[PDB]
Amino acid sequence: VQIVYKPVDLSKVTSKCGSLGNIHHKPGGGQVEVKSEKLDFKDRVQSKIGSLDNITHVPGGGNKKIETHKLTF
Amino acid sequence: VQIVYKPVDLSKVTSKCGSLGNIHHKPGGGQVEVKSEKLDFKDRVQSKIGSLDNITHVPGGGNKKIETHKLTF
Amino acid sequence: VQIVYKPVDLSKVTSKCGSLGNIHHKPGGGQVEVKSEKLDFKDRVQSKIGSLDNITHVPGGGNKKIETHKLTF
Amino acid sequence: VQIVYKPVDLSKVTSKCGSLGNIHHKPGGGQVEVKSEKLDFKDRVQSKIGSLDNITHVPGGGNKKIETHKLTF
Amino acid sequence: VQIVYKPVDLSKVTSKCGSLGNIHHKPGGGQVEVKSEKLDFKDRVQSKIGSLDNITHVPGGGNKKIETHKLTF
Amino acid sequence: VQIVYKPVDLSKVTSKCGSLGNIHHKPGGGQVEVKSEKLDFKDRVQSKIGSLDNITHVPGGGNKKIETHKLTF
Amino acid sequence: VQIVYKPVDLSKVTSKCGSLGNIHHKPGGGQVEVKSEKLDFKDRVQSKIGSLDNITHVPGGGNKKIETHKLTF
Amino acid sequence: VQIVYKPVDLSKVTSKCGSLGNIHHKPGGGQVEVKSEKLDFKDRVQSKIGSLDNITHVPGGGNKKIETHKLTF
Amino acid sequence: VQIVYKPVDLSKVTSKCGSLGNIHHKPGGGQVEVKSEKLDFKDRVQSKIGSLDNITHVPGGGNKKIETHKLTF
Amino acid sequence: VQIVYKPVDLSKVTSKCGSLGNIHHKPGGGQVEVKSEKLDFKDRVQSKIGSLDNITHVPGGGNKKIETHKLTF
């Protein structure tokens, strides 16, 4: 039995921008209630309860090359 | 049995920007209540309860090459 | 049995920026209540309860090559 | 049985910036209450209860190569 | 049985910045209450209760190569 | 010439209540913009521009006897 | 010429309440902008510009007898 | 010429309350901007610009007899 | 010419309360900006610019008899 | 010419309260900026610029008889 695994990337992920400029983010403040009795979180759980989070995310180039190579015999 | 694993990257992840400039982030303050009796968190849990978090994230290039190589016999 | 594992990176993760400039972050202060009786956190838990956290994160290049190589016989 | 593990990085993680400049961070002070009876934290727990933390994080290049190599026989 | 483990890094983690400049951080003082009866923290616990901590973190290059090599027979 | 002015009030303005009880007032935070050049206010003006005001008004009896007596010769 | 002015009040303005009780007032924080060049306020003006005011007003009897007597010859 | 002015008040302004009780007032913090060049305020002006004021007003009887008697010859 | 001015008050302004009790006032901290060039205030002006004032006002009887008597010949 | 001015008060302004009790006042700290070039305040002016003042005012009877008598020939 023989296996050869040899993938090749010459790939370009690229951007040009003259200026990002006048971004404004101005949210009025909302309201939240959450009510419960019992929570069980039991394997690899991600959770987010009753949050009011505001995000401004303004990268000078935010491109990405998420990648995966897997070999299982 | 023979395995050869030899992947190759000449890959470019890249940006150019003239200026990020006048980002403004001005959130009014909201309101949160969360109510519960019992919480059990029992394997690899991430959690976030009743948070009010504000984020400004303004990188001069925020690009990424998240990557994984795996071989299992 | 023979295994050869020899991956190669000539990879560039890169940025240019002329100036990040006039970032403003000015949040009004919200309000939080969280109520509970009993918390059990029992293996590798991350948790965050009732937090009001504000973040400004403005790196002169925040790019990344998060990476993993694994071999299991 | 034979294993050869010889990964190679010529990898560049890089930035250029002309100036980070006029970052402002001016948060108004919110309000928090958290209420409980009993907390048990029992293996590798991270926790953060009722915090009001403000962060300004402005590195002249904050890029990273978080990395991991693992071999298990 | 034979194992050869010989990973190679010619890797660069790098920055240039012309000047970090006029960072301002001016937080208003919030308010916190936290209430409990009993705390048990019992193996590798981190905790942070009722804190109001303000951080300004402005390094002239804050880049990093967090890394791990592990071999288990 | 003769004038007699002699009005009489035996009037009752009255209330009874067993309890006002569980009033709740929980408004989510709206948003306002107002834009103008020139305002002239020149005799007995009352004005209110761009306000976001919330009121809870819960009197244990809020009845009233607004009244006026006038004689002009 | 003769004028007699002799108005009489035996008037009752009155309340009874068993208890005002569980009033709650919990507004999320909205947002306001107001813009102008020139304001002239020139006789007996009342004004209120861009205000965000919250009021709870809970009197144990808030009744009133606003009144006026006037004679002009 | 003769004037007689002899108004009479036996008037009662009154309340009874068993208890005012559990008033709560918990406002999240909103946000305001006001912009101008020139203000002229020139006779008996009241003004209030860009204010964020919160009021709890809970009198054990707040009733009133605002009153005026005037005679002009 | 003759004037007689002889108004009479037997008036009662009154309250009874069993207890004011558990008033709570817990405001989160909002945010204000006010901008101008020139202010002229020139006769009997009241003004209040950019204020963030919080008030709790809880009198054991706050009733009033604001009153005025005037005679002009 | 004859004037008689003889107003009479048997007036009661009054309260009873059993106990004021558990007043709480717990403000989070907001944030203020005010900007200007030139101020002229020129006759009987009151002003209040950029203040953050918190007040708790809890008198065991705060009732009042603000009053004025005027005679002008």
Author numbering:
A (entry chain B), B (entry chain D), C (entry chain F), D (entry chain H), E (entry chain J), F (entry chain A), ...: 306 to 378
Question: What does the publication say?
Answer:
The Uppsala APP mutation (Δ690–695 in APP, Δ19–24 in Aβ) is the first known multi-codon deletion causing autosomal dominant AD. Discovered in three individuals from a family in Sweden, this mutation gives rise to a dominantly inherited form of early onset fAD. Post mortem analysis of Uppsala APP brain tissue is consistent with typical AD pathology, showing abundant deposition of extracellular Aβ plaques, primarily composed of AβUpp(1–42)Δ19–24 or an N-terminally truncated form, alongside intracellular tau tangles. To summarize, we solved the fibril structures underlying the tau and Aβ pathologies in a transgenic mouse model and a patient carrying the Uppsala APP mutation, the first known multi-codon deletion mutation in the APP gene leading to AD.
Immunogold negative stain EM with Nab228 as primary anti-Aβ antibody, which detects the amino-terminal region D1 to E11, showed that the sample contains a majority of unlabeled fibrils with a diameter of ~ 20 Å along with a smaller population of gold-labeled Aβ fibrils mainly observed in larger clumps. The 3D structure of these unlabeled fibrils was solved using cryo-EM, which reveals that the sample contains a majority of tau fibrils, mainly paired helical filaments (PHFs) alongside some straight filaments (SFs) (see below). We solved the structures of tau PHFs and SFs to a resolution of 3.3 Å and 3.4 Å, respectively. Additionally, from the human sample we determined the structures of tau paired helical filaments and tau straight filaments, which are identical to those found in sporadic AD cases. However, in contrast to patients with the Arctic APP mutation, Uppsala APP mutation patients also exhibit a minority of SF filaments, whose fold, like that of PHFs, is identical to the SF fold observed in sAD patients. Therefore, the tau pathology is identical to regular sAD even at the molecular level of tau fibrils. However, it is interesting to note that the PHF/SF ratio of 27:1 in the case of the Uppsala APP mutation is much higher than the ratio of 2.5:1 observed in the sAD case. Hence, the data confirm the presence of only a small population of Aβ fibrils. This agrees with the fact that AD patients who carry the Uppsala APP mutation show pathologically elevated concentrations of tau.
